[PDB]
Amino acid sequence: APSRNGMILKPHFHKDWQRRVATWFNQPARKIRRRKARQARARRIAPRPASGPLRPIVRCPTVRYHTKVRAGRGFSLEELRVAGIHKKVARTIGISVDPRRRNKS
């Protein structure tokens, strides 16, 4: 029974949520595991960059952002054709290649 000027609240606790509580006590150990896997990968690829292949210049869609520049999924095939690098050689070199990206500009 709501009384004397509170918010008209709608709590979503009508299901069996206590069986499905996801406690997050794993997460500092998970940060340790991700750190160990990242260091093992960096020791695996010994002269190569630890982050990975080169990511392209990519501008955000959805006119909210519209000015930020991101890292992309990969360089497009027209970009590889103008740069003079074959699409099956660029992956061996360490250049990100995806065949899905258009190039309208």
Partner RNA sequence: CGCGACCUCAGAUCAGACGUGGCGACCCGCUGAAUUUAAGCAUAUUAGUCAGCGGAGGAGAAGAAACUAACCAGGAUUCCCUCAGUAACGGCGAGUGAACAGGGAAGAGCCCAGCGCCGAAUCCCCGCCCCGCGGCGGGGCGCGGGACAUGUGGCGUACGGAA
The letter for the amino acid at 28 is P
Q: Which of 98, 85, 95, 83 is nearest to 48 (CA)?
A: 95
Q: How far is the CB of 105 from other proteins (least distance, A)?
A: 26
Q: Which of 32, 36, 41, 82 binds RNA (CB under 7 A)?
A: 41
Q: Which stretch binds other proteins (CB under 8 A): 2-10, 34-42, 59-67, 91-99?
A: 91-99
Residue 85 near residue 93 (C-beta atoms within 8 A): yes
Residues near other proteins (CB under 8 A), total? 18
Listed in sequence order, the residues at least 6 apart from 79 whose beta carbon sits closer than 8 Å to its beta carbon are: 56, 103
Region 58-87 residues binding RNA, contact defined as CB under 7 A: 58-68, 70-74, 77, 87
Q: Give the binding site for other proteins (CB under 8 A).
A: 15, 17, 20-25, 27, 47-49, 88-89, 91-94
